[PDB]
Scaffold this active site. Structure first.
Site: not given
Ligand SMILES: *C(=O)N1C[C@H](NOS(=O)(=O)O)CC[C@H]1C(N)=O
Length: 359
Positions: A271, A314, A65
């Site tokens: 963040e 992140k 992201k």
């Molecule tokens: C990000 O890696 N994805 C989205 C979401 N974000 O959370 S995170 O990085 O705290 O891990 C959940 C994990 C993950 C996904 N798509 O499973």
């Protein structure tokens, strides 16, 4: 000796967490005082004995992201879109849907009104299915009010940013963004010639896991990169002025905070936290309730520069991998931690905190 101390510090942070989480392989890259330092541990593939190096490719999951955000910052510098645009400006299929009343900023920062964590399993990687999902979606709550972390939300943000530039997202990343950032070991679709660097991912019973296709996967979670290239990206974030101006500005756009939830200030992708802050607090900002529950936002009166005495971070995961990136703009310090098991965010943050505290 300074190399002995740095190795001792990184080993002491990493080695117990690897054991404790049964992580097969892990790459650390640190940027300190303008110099890169790499520490590689374990196996990229257990079955074939291949060792992790700074060139091993890992899935970074949602860390992607931050690259999506950079593309969108490029579209913004070019005046192809504005954060206050209605999402449906950039995709006629969405005209007349609820995306007529949702901004690009709402999508980028997870406040569109309850877009879910993932697309439902009913939506496959198919343009028509994605289109029809968004056409039919209705908010649970007012746009701009509540943060609910969401792959479809920032996914649509990145898709619309690419539409605003007139080209597919993945093409723009490969042809323009990665080359502008100096990244030759960073992929959405790993070339066959690079496959030997692609680590295996490991789940339950050490089942092998490499990410499969999904809707808006590129925009949400689809980058594979090495520790060395991801640290190059962190160094670009630490010094955007060193890039050609449009790309400096694209990176700066990712260093602007729009609201707070708890200790965290939400930017585009990144963040941020005050620095110093306790380990517990940095773990709580990166906790499961932050990924999974809605939170009412405290909106800033104007966007805030995410610089100085702050840590920008992140997390990201796939079924087989667990990544974390953090940097401290005011200290010229960056760190990358890439692993081939999805191990808890709190543990990633534990490693990082120990290293950043000791640097
Ligand atoms: C990000 O890696 N994805 C989205 C979401 N974000 O959370 S995170 O990085 O705290 O891990 C959940 C994990 C993950 C996904 N798509 O499973």
């Amino acid at each position: 000796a300074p190399a002995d101390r740095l190795k001792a510090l990184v080993d002491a942070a990493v080695q117990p967490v690897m054991k404790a989480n049964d992580i097969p392989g892990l790459a650390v890259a640190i940027s300190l005082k303008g110099e890169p330092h790499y520490f590689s541990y374990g196996l990229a593939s257990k079955e074939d004995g291949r060792r992790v190096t700074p060139e091993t490719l890992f899935e970074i999951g949602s860390v992607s992201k931050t690259f999506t955000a950079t593309l969108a910052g490029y579209a913004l510098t070019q005046d192809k879109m504005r954060l206050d645009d209605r999402a449906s400006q950039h995709w006629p299929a969405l005209q007349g849907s609820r995306f007529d009343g949702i901004s690009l900023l709402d999508l980028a920062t997870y406040t569109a009104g309850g877009l879910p964590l993932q697309f439902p399993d009913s939506v496959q990687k198919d343009q028509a299915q994605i289109r029809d999902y968004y056409r039919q979606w209705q908010p649970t709550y007012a746009p701009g009010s509540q943060r609910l972390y969401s792959n479809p939300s920032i996914g649509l943000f990145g898709y619309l940013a690419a539409r605003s530039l007139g080209q597919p997202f993945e093409r723009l990343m490969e042809q323009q963004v990665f080359p502008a950032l100096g990244l030759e070991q960073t992929h959405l679709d790993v070339p066959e010639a690079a496959l030997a660097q692609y680590a295996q991912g490991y789940g339950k019973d050490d089942r092998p896991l490499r990410v499969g296709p999904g809707p808006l996967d590129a925009e949400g979670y689809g980058v594979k990169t090495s520790a060395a290239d991801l640290l190059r990206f962190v160094d670009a974030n630490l010094h955007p002025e060193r890039l050609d101006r449009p790309w400096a500005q694209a990176l700066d756009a990712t260093h602007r905070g729009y609201y707070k939830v708890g200790d965290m200030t939400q930017g585009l992708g990144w963040e941020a936290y005050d620095w110093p802050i306790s380990l517990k607090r940095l773990q709580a900002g990166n906790s499961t309730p932050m990924a999974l529950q809605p939170h009412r936002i405290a909106r800033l009166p104007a966007p805030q520069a995410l610089e100085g005495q702050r840590l920008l971070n992140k997390t990201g995961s796939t079924n087989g991998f667990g990544a974390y990136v953090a940097f401290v703009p005011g200290r010229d310090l960056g760190l990358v931690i890439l692993a081939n098991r999805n191990y808890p965010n709190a543990e990633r943050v534990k490693i990082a905190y120990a290293i950043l505290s000791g640097l």
